[PDB]
């Protein structure tokens, strides 16, 4: 079938499936943001999708970013009616450096880049264009609810 | 079809689909509990559901709570036929204030309320009735496993 | 089919197991003994490969016991159709560092204290070969061609 995608700015990029049978469409950052230990942000994708009713999108981590960095993405449940900007819900869960500073910053590959500041160690720079998350779409069941006193069939 | 729900106490609320085409059902806390930085708890819903065979429940965060507070909910996999009280598996992942106390507490909206004690900064109070989590029901594939020496299709 | 092929990569490997015929997932066992101290991160090998067919994704995910009773945080892995690699449990010990308090026991994945081979920092876990650390839940996926549109039709 087809999934409609709107790009909402010049900074947006069509999501992308790595191989032909891969679960997820890789999702790209539309923003450049510095995120220091213990900091939280919603990173904009500048992408809207129209998931049909009877499916849910799971906006979720990539295992390389996840395993190799302190960047923790809380999986977002994207409803069928939602035509807004998909935001990536992120925390840098590194423990604070208590003021050790260094001239480099980490990127989402776990490598060190040149920065515009001498920044606290454990700080990441997410750059516009970074392949930061993925979007997996799964069918759902959304029945009517019946309150009962008894069910019937850690 | 229909999903059966049992309210297990007077503090239990029915799960709630917010908007017409929402994936899941919002789940309320049946307890009032303080959760200071780095603390963990299973928050009782006092609700049981009966997910049919062929499905799993995902008992998961709401994006507002998740993004605006330090309350981290670990997604629960709710098996068909689990008829127990659904527990919300939660951590306050704020780093401890090292002794700094404030007369307010945070709630799940990110906002400050009067509290019963002067409490460590970064503490949340979860109140009975708070819309804390959500439940999304997905079909599953549950095959027999075959051990193979080599993969063959 | 209603068959999933599974390939054990070593003698430290254990066949995944369903807990009841009503359970969503297959319990997945550690193939390695690893110590994980507060704030540390690792990918725990299972020495299991699976062949998830096209149209599905595996979700390599926490068990509620381990998760609620310990500081071991497992980031849910999205296991693609046709990935025949070693399944890796992406794990962090998210306890805050005990700053040099050491004790003769270590924690296990059940929240209990075991004798260990070193006097280690308090909050450290020992994950043992054969521990039932995660589960795998397999769900159908929707993988449509994306259509970029100008307008659709928290
Ligand atoms: O990580 C996320 C999560 C959600 N979203 C969007 C899509 C989703 O359909 C919408 C609402 O998700 P939640 O229901 O998880 N948030 P909450 O329940 O706090 O807000 P609302 O009152 O709108 O349902 O927010 C994101 O862009 N990224
Ligand atoms: O966040 C959760 C997760 C699970 N549960 C319930 C429903 C689920 O069917 C049940 C078991 O889930 P797991 O299989 O993840 N727990 P574990 O494997 O530790 O226990 P068991 O041996 O009972 O399967 O616990 C919750 O109430 N909240
Ligand atoms: O926790 C995990 C996650 C993934 N995996 C495997 C299975 C999956 O099919 C593969 C890649 O998953 P991602 O797409 O999340 N990783 P990434 O996007 O960083 O790498 P790739 O470039 O391989 O897509 O790694 C694990 O063994 N454990
Ligand atoms: Mg990938
Ligand atoms: Mg909602
Ligand atoms: Mg289990
Ligand atoms: Mg933490």
* Residue of minimum CA distance from atom 25 in ligand 1: C154
Closest CA to A135 of A45, A53, A67, A66: A45
Contacts of A136 in chain C (CB under 8 A): 57, 78, 141
Which C residues 75-114 touch A at CB under 8 Å? 75-78, 80-82, 88, 90, 92, 94, 96-97
Q: Report the C-alpha gap between B84 and B51 in whole angstroms.
A: 12
What are the binding residues of B for Mg(2+)?
Answer: 93
Domain spans in chain A, listed from the N-terminal domain onward:
1-154
Give residue for tokens 């906006």.
Answer: A59
Q: Report the C-alpha gap between C18 and C27 in whole angstroms.
A: 6
Q: Report the C-alpha gap between A87 and A41 in whole angstroms.
A: 9
CB A85 within 8 A of CB A48: yes
Closest-CA distance, A46 to chain C, in angstroms, reads 13
Assigned superfamily of A1-154: Deoxyuridine triphosphatase (dUTPase) (2.70.40.10)
CB A125 within 8 A of CB A145: no
Which C residues 6-65 touch A at CB under 8 Å? 39, 41, 43, 54, 57, 64-65
Q: Report the C-alpha gap between A67 and A84 in whole angstroms.
A: 29
- Breaks in chain B (C to N > 2.5 A) come right after none
CB A138 within 8 A of CB C142: yes
Nearest atom in ligand 2 to the alpha carbon of residue C20 is 24
Collapsing DSSP to helix, strand or coil, C68 comes out as: helix
Of C4, C61, C68, the CB nearest to B42: C68
Q: Report the C-alpha gap between B120 and B122 in whole angstroms.
A: 6
Please tell me the distance between residue B80's alpha carbon and the centre of ligand 2 in angstroms: 11
Closest CA to B93 of C96, A47, A100: C96
Q: Report the C-alpha gap between A146 and B2 in whole angstroms.
A: 6
Q: What's the sign of the alpha-carbon dihedral B149, B151, C4, C7? A: positive
* CATH number listed for the domain at residues B1-153: 2.70.40.10
Q: Report the C-alpha gap between C92 and A109 in whole angstroms.
A: 18
**CB contact (8 A) between residue B1 and residue A56:** no
Query: Method of determination?
Result: X-ray
Q: Report the C-alpha gap between C25 and B50 in whole angstroms.
A: 17
Closest-CA distance, A13 to chain B, in angstroms, reads 23
CB B148 within 8 A of CB A91: no
């Amino acid at each position: 079938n087809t999934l409609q995608v709107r790009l909402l700015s010049e900074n947006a990029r069509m999501p992308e499936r790595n191989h032909k049978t891969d679960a997820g469409y890789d999702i790209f950052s539309a923003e450049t943001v510095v995120l220091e230990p213990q900091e939280k942000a919603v990173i904009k994708t500048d992408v809207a999708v129209s998931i049909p009713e009877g499916y849910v999108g799971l906006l979720t981590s990539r295992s390389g970013v996840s395993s190799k960095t302190h960047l923790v993405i809380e999986t977002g449940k994207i409803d069928a009616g939602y035509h807004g900007n998909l935001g990536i819900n992120i925390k840098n869960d590194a423990i604070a450096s208590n003021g050790y500073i260094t001239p480099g910053v980490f990127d989402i590959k776990g490598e060190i880049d040149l920065s515009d500041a001498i920044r606290q160690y454990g700080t990441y720079q997410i750059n516009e264009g970074d392949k930061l998350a993925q979007l997996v779409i799964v069918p759902i069941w959304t029945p009517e609810l019946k309150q009962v006193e008894e069910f019937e069939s850690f």
